[PDB]
Amino acid sequence: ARQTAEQRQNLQAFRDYIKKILDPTYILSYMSSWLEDEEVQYIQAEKNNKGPMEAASLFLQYLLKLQSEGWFQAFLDALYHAGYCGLCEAIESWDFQKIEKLEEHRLLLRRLEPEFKATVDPNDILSELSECLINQECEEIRQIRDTKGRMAGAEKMAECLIRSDKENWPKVLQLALEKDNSKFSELWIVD
Amino acid sequence: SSARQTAEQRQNLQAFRDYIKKILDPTYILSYMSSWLEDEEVQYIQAEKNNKGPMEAASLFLQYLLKLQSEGWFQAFLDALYHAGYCGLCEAIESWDFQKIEKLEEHRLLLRRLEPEFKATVDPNDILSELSECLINQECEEIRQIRDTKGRMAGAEKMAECLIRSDKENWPKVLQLALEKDNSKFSELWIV
Amino acid sequence: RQTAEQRQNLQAFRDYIKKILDPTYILSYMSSWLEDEEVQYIQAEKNNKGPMEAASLFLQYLLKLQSEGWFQAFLDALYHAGYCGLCEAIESWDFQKIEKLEEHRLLLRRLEPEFKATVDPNDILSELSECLINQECEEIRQIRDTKGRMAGAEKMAECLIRSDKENWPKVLQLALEKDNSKFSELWIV
Amino acid sequence: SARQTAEQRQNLQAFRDYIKKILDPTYILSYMSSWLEDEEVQYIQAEKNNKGPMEAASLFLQYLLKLQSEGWFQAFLDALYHAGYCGLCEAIESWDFQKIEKLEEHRLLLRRLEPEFKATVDPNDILSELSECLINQECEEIRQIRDTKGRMAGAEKMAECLIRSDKENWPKVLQLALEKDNSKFSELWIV
Ligand SMILES: [Cl-]
Ligand SMILES: [Cl-]
Ligand SMILES: [Cl-]
């Protein structure tokens, strides 16, 4: 049970990468047997009241105090089956290089988000990008597009890509933008 | 509501505290809370629901309820539960018999564990109408709002969480029947 | 004086009101009595939780007002929005006509699946318009025209269940019979 | 310089009530996401969804008044302008809200007439004539509501956006559009 101590120290070290990717509300269905119903609802309420990142921070607070045998592997499995293969792979090997290399394109898309909202319609490329987002994120993007309009939906799409753990989502996005012939492709340089 | 009757009413509430806090959202009996509780205590209970969730709000509501002394607080509580829709929970408290609510535990755990498969194969728009009498009236309304603002998986998860907290003795069977009408991949996983 | 008495009756009957009233339909009449934040909080509650939770929040605010004439503004707003039945009940504090509808609220709740399968709102919406708020009829038509018959049929069923019109069950029977629909055989009043 | 920061904070605090009646911060967050913490950005978005624009703007100002990085104020002005808040930008930049105060009379009149507006105006008829007075994303949300919930729902959303418009002449543009459509509401809206 020194492995656990080493596992706890590393999570705190990499909490800034984790909270930038993980929306814990998406992996609570795979971890419900490890958390109290009250803890599940507190994490869910924190997401609705403050956002994904603070919800992830609270989820880690609970995660770092668990003691049952195998709590860490349960987290890895929950991440994987929810769709966080990239984040799961990074945590399992404590190597965030593939996620660090994405920082440049996280900064670029966030800086260019106004042009993104002005020139991209999520209804045109969401299917091509469904391998870079959690299935529920794609569902929320379509509902927002259907209730609030194109610009509102495009912003949700941009925010979801920024938190994607797929090492090549910038290239996936470039290909989708070119297939639809979008003014934004001229602003998106991958290779 | 003498001294020997409050003690029995208090003893009964604590005896079933885990059954109550797993079913009751005190936000739904707010007209009872405001006429029997201090206004400040009501707002703390409301803050607890918004900030922590229904279960923590129910736990806090019970703390206040167990300290009341006013005449008729217990029977008023039962009356509130019934008119809110908590017929099963109200019927259980009056007769100290939670057998019908205990038989549901088997299906509460099953749906909780199978929640990923539920969200993946079920659309509340297909079964919400069939399941209305198993949920509180406000729960049906929030399920549709979530379904329309966040999508199918989000609405399905809220529905599953509301079924888990249902006190209707036969909601597992009603759910199975609705699932069969649509011929859904989840029916093979839901045995009653 | 009468404010204090009117305040006490609202709390007594709040649960009947929030079963009928969607405050989103009377906020255009009441914005001068509520802070802008309170108006928008009620609107967000409607979008996030539904009419009933929005009505509960509106009543909490309404029960703390003190300005002169807030109650009379509420009655008039109910009328101009279309809540004639609910307005008539509040003026006399007699909810017998709305209580008597509970039997048919439960029946239409039971039969909503059969309703969605056999009823087209485009056929009876006009006959039932005086049982619904005008804005509800518009949303039923938008749903019917964008999402299909069942979606509009479900929206209609949910709106009738919340109707304060004392004779909407009989109006529904007659309209369904006028069109000769398979659901009329299950709807007898 | 700290002097300019200090003076800019006092003036923002001085006008916080004019700002929070016009500014929906969700519309200028894409231009300022680089100046706020990810947590602060998402909390502002949750506040909009949970409480509305005014509470979101009030929360946004609390964060704005604690910034210290070089150029945060000019970034705020740039975000406002390019989002479409030219009038509010002109008012904040020059500390003159005369044009926005002069609108108070017509904000009150339209709000009072909101029932008559919803009953006689269809956004499909005047939205194009009025798009100059509204944020581009507001026009998209008006059409989505108009197309999913109907005319009265869209008409009320339209009035709410006009009420928060920072264009000094939106009352006159509305009158002209209502006359072009020959609308029952024109008899109630002059000047
Ligand atoms: Cl209430
Ligand atoms: Cl536009
Ligand atoms: Cl002009």
CSV table of N, CA and C in Angstrom, one decimal, chain A residues 52-186:
chain,number,residue,atom,x,y,z
A,52,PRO,N,-17.4,22.6,-15.5
A,52,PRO,CA,-16.7,21.3,-15.5
A,52,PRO,C,-15.5,21.3,-14.7
A,53,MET,N,-14.7,22.3,-14.8
A,53,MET,CA,-13.3,22.3,-14.2
A,53,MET,C,-13.4,22.2,-12.6
A,54,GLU,N,-14.3,23.0,-12.0
A,54,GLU,CA,-14.4,23.0,-10.6
A,54,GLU,C,-15.0,21.6,-10.2
A,55,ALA,N,-15.9,21.1,-11.0
A,55,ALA,CA,-16.5,19.7,-10.7
A,55,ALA,C,-15.3,18.7,-10.8
A,56,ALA,N,-14.4,18.8,-11.7
A,56,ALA,CA,-13.3,17.9,-11.8
A,56,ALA,C,-12.4,18.1,-10.5
A,57,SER,N,-12.2,19.3,-10.1
A,57,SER,CA,-11.4,19.5,-8.9
A,57,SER,C,-12.0,18.9,-7.7
A,58,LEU,N,-13.3,19.0,-7.5
A,58,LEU,CA,-14.0,18.3,-6.4
A,58,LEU,C,-14.0,16.8,-6.6
A,59,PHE,N,-14.1,16.3,-7.8
A,59,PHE,CA,-14.1,14.9,-8.0
A,59,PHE,C,-12.7,14.3,-7.6
A,60,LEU,N,-11.6,15.0,-7.9
A,60,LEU,CA,-10.3,14.6,-7.5
A,60,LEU,C,-10.2,14.6,-5.9
A,61,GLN,N,-10.8,15.6,-5.3
A,61,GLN,CA,-10.7,15.6,-3.8
A,61,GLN,C,-11.3,14.3,-3.2
A,62,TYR,N,-12.4,13.9,-3.8
A,62,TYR,CA,-13.0,12.6,-3.3
A,62,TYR,C,-12.0,11.4,-3.7
A,63,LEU,N,-11.6,11.4,-5.0
A,63,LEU,CA,-10.7,10.4,-5.5
A,63,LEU,C,-9.5,10.2,-4.6
A,64,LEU,N,-8.9,11.3,-4.2
A,64,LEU,CA,-7.6,11.2,-3.4
A,64,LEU,C,-7.8,10.8,-2.0
A,65,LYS,N,-9.0,10.6,-1.5
A,65,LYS,CA,-9.3,10.1,-0.2
A,65,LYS,C,-9.9,8.7,-0.1
A,66,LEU,N,-10.1,8.1,-1.3
A,66,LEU,CA,-10.6,6.7,-1.3
A,66,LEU,C,-9.5,5.8,-0.8
A,67,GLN,N,-10.0,4.7,-0.2
A,67,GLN,CA,-9.1,3.7,0.3
A,67,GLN,C,-9.3,2.2,-0.1
A,68,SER,N,-10.5,1.9,-0.6
A,68,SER,CA,-10.8,0.5,-0.9
A,68,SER,C,-9.8,0.0,-1.9
A,69,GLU,N,-9.6,-1.3,-1.9
A,69,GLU,CA,-8.6,-1.9,-2.8
A,69,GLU,C,-9.0,-1.7,-4.2
A,70,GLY,N,-8.2,-1.2,-5.1
A,70,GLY,CA,-8.4,-1.1,-6.5
A,70,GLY,C,-9.1,0.2,-6.9
A,71,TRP,N,-9.2,1.2,-6.0
A,71,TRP,CA,-9.9,2.4,-6.4
A,71,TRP,C,-9.3,3.1,-7.6
A,72,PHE,N,-7.9,3.0,-7.7
A,72,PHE,CA,-7.3,3.7,-8.8
A,72,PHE,C,-7.6,3.0,-10.2
A,73,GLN,N,-7.6,1.7,-10.2
A,73,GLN,CA,-7.9,1.0,-11.5
A,73,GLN,C,-9.4,1.3,-11.8
A,74,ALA,N,-10.3,1.4,-10.8
A,74,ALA,CA,-11.6,1.7,-11.1
A,74,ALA,C,-11.7,3.1,-11.9
A,75,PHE,N,-10.9,4.1,-11.4
A,75,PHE,CA,-10.9,5.4,-12.1
A,75,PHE,C,-10.4,5.2,-13.5
A,76,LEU,N,-9.3,4.5,-13.7
A,76,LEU,CA,-8.8,4.3,-15.1
A,76,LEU,C,-9.9,3.6,-16.0
A,77,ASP,N,-10.5,2.6,-15.5
A,77,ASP,CA,-11.6,1.9,-16.3
A,77,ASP,C,-12.7,2.9,-16.6
A,78,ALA,N,-13.1,3.7,-15.6
A,78,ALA,CA,-14.2,4.6,-15.8
A,78,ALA,C,-13.8,5.6,-16.9
A,79,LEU,N,-12.6,6.2,-16.8
A,79,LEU,CA,-12.2,7.1,-17.8
A,79,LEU,C,-12.2,6.5,-19.2
A,80,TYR,N,-11.7,5.2,-19.3
A,80,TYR,CA,-11.6,4.6,-20.6
A,80,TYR,C,-13.0,4.4,-21.3
A,81,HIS,N,-13.9,3.7,-20.5
A,81,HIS,CA,-15.2,3.4,-21.1
A,81,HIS,C,-16.1,4.6,-21.3
A,82,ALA,N,-15.8,5.7,-20.6
A,82,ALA,CA,-16.5,6.9,-20.9
A,82,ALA,C,-16.1,7.5,-22.2
A,83,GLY,N,-14.8,7.2,-22.6
A,83,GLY,CA,-14.3,7.7,-23.8
A,83,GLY,C,-12.9,8.4,-23.7
A,84,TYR,N,-12.5,8.6,-22.4
A,84,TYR,CA,-11.2,9.3,-22.2
A,84,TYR,C,-10.0,8.4,-22.3
A,85,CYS,N,-9.9,7.8,-23.5
A,85,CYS,CA,-8.8,6.9,-23.8
A,85,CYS,C,-7.4,7.7,-23.7
A,86,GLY,N,-7.4,8.9,-24.3
A,86,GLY,CA,-6.1,9.6,-24.2
A,86,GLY,C,-5.7,10.0,-22.8
A,87,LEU,N,-6.7,10.5,-22.0
A,87,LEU,CA,-6.4,10.9,-20.7
A,87,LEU,C,-6.1,9.6,-19.8
A,88,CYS,N,-6.8,8.5,-20.1
A,88,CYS,CA,-6.6,7.3,-19.4
A,88,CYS,C,-5.2,6.8,-19.7
A,89,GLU,N,-4.8,6.8,-21.0
A,89,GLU,CA,-3.4,6.4,-21.4
A,89,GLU,C,-2.4,7.2,-20.7
A,90,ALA,N,-2.6,8.6,-20.6
A,90,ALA,CA,-1.6,9.4,-20.0
A,90,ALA,C,-1.4,9.2,-18.5
A,91,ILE,N,-2.6,9.0,-17.8
A,91,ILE,CA,-2.5,8.7,-16.4
A,91,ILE,C,-1.9,7.3,-16.1
A,92,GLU,N,-2.2,6.3,-16.9
A,92,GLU,CA,-1.7,5.0,-16.7
A,92,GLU,C,-0.2,4.9,-16.8
A,93,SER,N,0.4,5.8,-17.7
A,93,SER,CA,1.8,5.8,-17.9
A,93,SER,C,2.5,7.0,-17.3
A,94,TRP,N,1.7,8.0,-16.7
A,94,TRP,CA,2.2,9.2,-16.2
A,94,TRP,C,3.1,9.9,-17.2
A,95,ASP,N,2.6,9.9,-18.5
A,95,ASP,CA,3.3,10.6,-19.6
A,95,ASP,C,2.2,11.5,-20.3
A,96,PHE,N,2.3,12.8,-20.1
A,96,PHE,CA,1.3,13.7,-20.7
A,96,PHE,C,1.8,14.4,-21.9
A,97,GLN,N,2.8,13.8,-22.6
A,97,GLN,CA,3.5,14.5,-23.7
A,97,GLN,C,2.5,14.7,-24.9
A,98,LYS,N,1.7,13.7,-25.2
A,98,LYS,CA,0.7,13.9,-26.3
A,98,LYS,C,-0.3,14.9,-26.0
A,99,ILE,N,-0.6,15.1,-24.7
A,99,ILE,CA,-1.6,16.1,-24.3
A,99,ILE,C,-0.9,17.5,-24.2
A,100,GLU,N,0.4,17.6,-23.8
A,100,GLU,CA,1.1,18.8,-23.8
A,100,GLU,C,1.2,19.4,-25.2
A,101,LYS,N,1.6,18.5,-26.2
A,101,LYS,CA,1.7,19.0,-27.5
A,101,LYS,C,0.5,19.6,-28.1
A,102,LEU,N,-0.7,19.3,-27.5
A,102,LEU,CA,-1.9,19.9,-28.0
A,102,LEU,C,-2.1,21.4,-27.5
A,103,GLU,N,-1.3,21.8,-26.5
A,103,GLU,CA,-1.5,23.1,-25.9
A,103,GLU,C,-1.5,24.2,-27.0
A,104,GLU,N,-0.6,24.1,-28.0
A,104,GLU,CA,-0.5,25.1,-29.0
A,104,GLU,C,-1.8,25.3,-29.7
A,105,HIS,N,-2.5,24.1,-30.0
A,105,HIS,CA,-3.8,24.2,-30.7
A,105,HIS,C,-5.0,24.5,-29.8
A,106,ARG,N,-4.8,24.3,-28.5
A,106,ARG,CA,-5.8,24.8,-27.6
A,106,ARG,C,-5.8,26.3,-27.5
A,107,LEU,N,-4.6,26.9,-27.5
A,107,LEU,CA,-4.4,28.3,-27.5
A,107,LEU,C,-4.9,28.9,-28.8
A,108,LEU,N,-4.6,28.3,-29.9
A,108,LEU,CA,-5.0,28.8,-31.2
A,108,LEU,C,-6.5,28.9,-31.4
A,109,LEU,N,-7.2,27.8,-31.1
A,109,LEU,CA,-8.7,27.7,-31.3
A,109,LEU,C,-9.4,28.7,-30.3
A,110,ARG,N,-8.8,28.8,-29.1
A,110,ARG,CA,-9.4,29.8,-28.1
A,110,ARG,C,-9.2,31.2,-28.6
A,111,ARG,N,-8.1,31.5,-29.1
A,111,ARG,CA,-7.8,32.9,-29.6
A,111,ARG,C,-8.7,33.2,-30.8
A,112,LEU,N,-8.9,32.2,-31.7
A,112,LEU,CA,-9.7,32.3,-32.9
A,112,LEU,C,-11.2,32.0,-32.7
A,113,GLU,N,-11.6,31.8,-31.5
A,113,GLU,CA,-13.0,31.4,-31.3
A,113,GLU,C,-14.0,32.4,-31.9
A,114,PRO,N,-13.8,33.7,-31.8
A,114,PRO,CA,-14.8,34.6,-32.5
A,114,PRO,C,-14.9,34.3,-34.0
A,115,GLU,N,-13.8,34.1,-34.7
A,115,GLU,CA,-13.9,33.8,-36.1
A,115,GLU,C,-14.6,32.4,-36.3
A,116,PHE,N,-14.3,31.5,-35.3
A,116,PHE,CA,-14.9,30.1,-35.4
A,116,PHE,C,-16.4,30.2,-35.3
A,117,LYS,N,-16.9,31.0,-34.3
A,117,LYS,CA,-18.3,31.1,-34.1
A,117,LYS,C,-19.0,31.8,-35.3
A,118,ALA,N,-18.2,32.7,-36.1
A,118,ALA,CA,-18.7,33.4,-37.2
A,118,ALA,C,-18.7,32.6,-38.5
A,119,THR,N,-17.9,31.6,-38.6
A,119,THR,CA,-17.8,30.9,-39.9
A,119,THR,C,-18.0,29.4,-39.9
A,120,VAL,N,-18.2,28.8,-38.7
A,120,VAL,CA,-18.4,27.4,-38.7
A,120,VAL,C,-19.8,27.1,-38.2
A,121,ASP,N,-20.5,26.1,-38.8
A,121,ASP,CA,-21.8,25.6,-38.4
A,121,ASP,C,-21.5,24.2,-37.8
A,122,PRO,N,-21.7,23.9,-36.6
A,122,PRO,CA,-21.5,22.6,-36.1
A,122,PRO,C,-22.2,21.5,-36.8
A,123,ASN,N,-23.4,21.8,-37.3
A,123,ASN,CA,-24.2,20.8,-38.0
A,123,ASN,C,-23.5,20.3,-39.3
A,124,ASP,N,-22.4,20.9,-39.7
A,124,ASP,CA,-21.7,20.5,-40.9
A,124,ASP,C,-20.5,19.6,-40.7
A,125,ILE,N,-19.9,19.7,-39.5
A,125,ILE,CA,-18.7,18.9,-39.3
A,125,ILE,C,-18.8,18.1,-38.0
A,126,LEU,N,-19.9,18.1,-37.2
A,126,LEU,CA,-19.9,17.4,-36.0
A,126,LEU,C,-19.8,15.9,-36.2
A,127,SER,N,-20.4,15.4,-37.2
A,127,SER,CA,-20.2,13.9,-37.5
A,127,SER,C,-18.8,13.5,-37.7
A,128,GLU,N,-18.0,14.3,-38.5
A,128,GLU,CA,-16.6,14.1,-38.8
A,128,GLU,C,-15.8,14.1,-37.5
A,129,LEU,N,-16.3,14.9,-36.5
A,129,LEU,CA,-15.5,15.1,-35.3
A,129,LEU,C,-16.0,14.3,-34.1
A,130,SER,N,-17.0,13.4,-34.3
A,130,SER,CA,-17.5,12.6,-33.2
A,130,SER,C,-16.5,11.7,-32.6
A,131,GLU,N,-15.4,11.5,-33.2
A,131,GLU,CA,-14.3,10.6,-32.6
A,131,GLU,C,-13.4,11.4,-31.7
A,132,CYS,N,-13.6,12.8,-31.6
A,132,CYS,CA,-12.8,13.6,-30.8
A,132,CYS,C,-13.5,14.1,-29.5
A,133,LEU,N,-14.8,13.8,-29.5
A,133,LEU,CA,-15.6,14.3,-28.4
A,133,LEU,C,-16.3,13.1,-27.7
A,134,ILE,N,-16.7,13.3,-26.4
A,134,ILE,CA,-17.6,12.3,-25.8
A,134,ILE,C,-18.9,12.4,-26.4
A,135,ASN,N,-19.6,11.2,-26.5
A,135,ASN,CA,-20.9,11.1,-27.2
A,135,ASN,C,-21.9,12.1,-26.6
A,136,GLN,N,-21.8,12.3,-25.3
A,136,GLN,CA,-22.8,13.3,-24.7
A,136,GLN,C,-22.5,14.7,-25.1
A,137,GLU,N,-21.2,15.0,-25.3
A,137,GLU,CA,-20.8,16.4,-25.8
A,137,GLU,C,-21.4,16.7,-27.1
A,138,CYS,N,-21.4,15.7,-28.0
A,138,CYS,CA,-22.0,15.8,-29.4
A,138,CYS,C,-23.5,16.1,-29.2
A,139,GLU,N,-24.2,15.4,-28.3
A,139,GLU,CA,-25.6,15.6,-28.1
A,139,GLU,C,-25.9,16.9,-27.5
A,140,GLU,N,-25.1,17.5,-26.6
A,140,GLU,CA,-25.3,18.8,-26.1
A,140,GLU,C,-25.1,19.9,-27.2
A,141,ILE,N,-24.1,19.7,-28.0
A,141,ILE,CA,-23.8,20.6,-29.1
A,141,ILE,C,-25.0,20.7,-30.1
A,142,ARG,N,-25.6,19.6,-30.4
A,142,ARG,CA,-26.8,19.6,-31.3
A,142,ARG,C,-28.0,20.3,-30.6
A,143,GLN,N,-28.2,20.0,-29.3
A,143,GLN,CA,-29.3,20.7,-28.7
A,143,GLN,C,-29.2,22.2,-28.6
A,144,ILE,N,-28.0,22.6,-28.3
A,144,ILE,CA,-27.7,24.1,-28.2
A,144,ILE,C,-27.9,24.7,-29.6
A,145,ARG,N,-27.3,24.0,-30.6
A,145,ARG,CA,-27.5,24.5,-32.0
A,145,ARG,C,-29.0,24.6,-32.3
A,146,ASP,N,-29.8,23.6,-31.8
A,146,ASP,CA,-31.2,23.6,-32.2
A,146,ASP,C,-32.1,24.5,-31.3
A,147,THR,N,-31.6,24.9,-30.2
A,147,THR,CA,-32.3,25.8,-29.3
A,147,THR,C,-31.8,27.3,-29.3
A,148,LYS,N,-30.5,27.5,-29.5
A,148,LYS,CA,-29.9,28.8,-29.5
A,148,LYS,C,-29.3,29.3,-30.8
A,149,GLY,N,-29.1,28.5,-31.7
A,149,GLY,CA,-28.6,28.9,-33.0
A,149,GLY,C,-27.2,28.4,-33.4
A,150,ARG,N,-26.7,28.9,-34.5
A,150,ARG,CA,-25.4,28.4,-35.0
A,150,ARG,C,-24.3,28.9,-34.1
A,151,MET,N,-24.2,30.2,-33.9
A,151,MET,CA,-23.1,30.8,-33.1
A,151,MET,C,-23.0,30.1,-31.7
A,152,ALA,N,-24.1,30.0,-31.1
A,152,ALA,CA,-24.2,29.3,-29.7
A,152,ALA,C,-23.6,27.9,-29.8
A,153,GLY,N,-24.1,27.2,-30.8
A,153,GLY,CA,-23.6,25.8,-31.0
A,153,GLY,C,-22.2,25.7,-31.4
A,154,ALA,N,-21.7,26.6,-32.2
A,154,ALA,CA,-20.3,26.6,-32.6
A,154,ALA,C,-19.4,26.8,-31.5
A,155,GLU,N,-19.8,27.7,-30.5
A,155,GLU,CA,-19.0,28.0,-29.4
A,155,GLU,C,-18.9,26.7,-28.5
A,156,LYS,N,-20.0,26.0,-28.3
A,156,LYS,CA,-20.0,24.8,-27.5
A,156,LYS,C,-19.0,23.8,-28.2
A,157,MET,N,-19.1,23.7,-29.5
A,157,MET,CA,-18.2,22.8,-30.2
A,157,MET,C,-16.7,23.2,-29.9
A,158,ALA,N,-16.4,24.4,-30.1
A,158,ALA,CA,-15.0,24.9,-29.8
A,158,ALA,C,-14.6,24.6,-28.4
A,159,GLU,N,-15.4,24.8,-27.4
A,159,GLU,CA,-15.1,24.5,-26.1
A,159,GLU,C,-14.8,23.0,-25.8
A,160,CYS,N,-15.6,22.2,-26.5
A,160,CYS,CA,-15.4,20.7,-26.4
A,160,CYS,C,-14.1,20.2,-27.0
A,161,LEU,N,-13.7,20.8,-28.2
A,161,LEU,CA,-12.5,20.4,-28.8
A,161,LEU,C,-11.3,20.8,-27.9
A,162,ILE,N,-11.3,22.0,-27.3
A,162,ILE,CA,-10.2,22.5,-26.5
A,162,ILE,C,-9.9,21.5,-25.4
A,163,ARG,N,-11.0,20.8,-24.9
A,163,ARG,CA,-10.8,19.8,-23.8
A,163,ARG,C,-10.7,18.4,-24.3
A,164,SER,N,-10.5,18.2,-25.6
A,164,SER,CA,-10.4,16.8,-26.1
A,164,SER,C,-9.0,16.3,-25.8
A,165,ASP,N,-9.0,15.0,-25.5
A,165,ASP,CA,-7.8,14.3,-25.2
A,165,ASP,C,-7.3,13.4,-26.4
A,166,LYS,N,-7.9,13.6,-27.6
A,166,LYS,CA,-7.4,12.9,-28.7
A,166,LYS,C,-6.2,13.6,-29.3
A,167,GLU,N,-5.1,12.9,-29.4
A,167,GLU,CA,-3.8,13.5,-29.8
A,167,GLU,C,-3.9,14.2,-31.1
A,168,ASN,N,-4.8,13.9,-32.0
A,168,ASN,CA,-4.8,14.4,-33.4
A,168,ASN,C,-6.1,15.1,-33.7
A,169,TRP,N,-6.8,15.6,-32.7
A,169,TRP,CA,-8.0,16.3,-33.0
A,169,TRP,C,-7.8,17.6,-33.8
A,170,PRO,N,-6.6,18.3,-33.7
A,170,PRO,CA,-6.4,19.4,-34.6
A,170,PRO,C,-6.4,18.9,-36.1
A,171,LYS,N,-5.8,17.8,-36.4
A,171,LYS,CA,-5.8,17.2,-37.7
A,171,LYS,C,-7.1,16.8,-38.1
A,172,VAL,N,-7.9,16.1,-37.2
A,172,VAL,CA,-9.2,15.7,-37.5
A,172,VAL,C,-10.1,16.9,-37.8
A,173,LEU,N,-9.9,18.0,-37.1
A,173,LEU,CA,-10.7,19.2,-37.4
A,173,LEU,C,-10.3,19.8,-38.7
A,174,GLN,N,-9.0,19.9,-39.0
A,174,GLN,CA,-8.6,20.4,-40.3
A,174,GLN,C,-9.3,19.7,-41.5
A,175,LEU,N,-9.3,18.3,-41.4
A,175,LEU,CA,-9.9,17.5,-42.5
A,175,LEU,C,-11.4,17.8,-42.6
A,176,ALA,N,-12.1,17.9,-41.5
A,176,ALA,CA,-13.5,18.2,-41.5
A,176,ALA,C,-13.8,19.6,-42.1
A,177,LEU,N,-12.9,20.6,-41.8
A,177,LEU,CA,-13.1,21.9,-42.3
A,177,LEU,C,-12.9,22.0,-43.8
A,178,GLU,N,-11.9,21.2,-44.3
A,178,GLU,CA,-11.6,21.2,-45.7
A,178,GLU,C,-12.8,20.5,-46.5
A,179,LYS,N,-13.3,19.4,-45.9
A,179,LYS,CA,-14.4,18.7,-46.6
A,179,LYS,C,-15.6,19.6,-46.8
A,180,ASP,N,-15.9,20.5,-45.9
A,180,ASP,CA,-17.0,21.4,-45.9
A,180,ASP,C,-16.7,22.7,-46.6
A,181,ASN,N,-15.4,22.9,-47.0
A,181,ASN,CA,-15.0,24.2,-47.6
A,181,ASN,C,-15.4,25.3,-46.7
A,182,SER,N,-14.7,25.6,-45.6
A,182,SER,CA,-15.1,26.6,-44.6
A,182,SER,C,-14.0,27.6,-44.6
A,183,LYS,N,-14.4,28.9,-44.4
A,183,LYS,CA,-13.5,30.0,-44.4
A,183,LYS,C,-12.4,29.8,-43.2
A,184,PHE,N,-12.8,29.0,-42.2
A,184,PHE,CA,-11.9,28.8,-41.1
A,184,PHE,C,-10.7,28.0,-41.4
A,185,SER,N,-10.8,27.1,-42.4
A,185,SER,CA,-9.6,26.2,-42.7
A,185,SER,C,-8.4,27.0,-43.0
A,186,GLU,N,-8.5,28.2,-43.7
A,186,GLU,CA,-7.4,29.0,-44.0
A,186,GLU,C,-6.7,29.5,-42.8
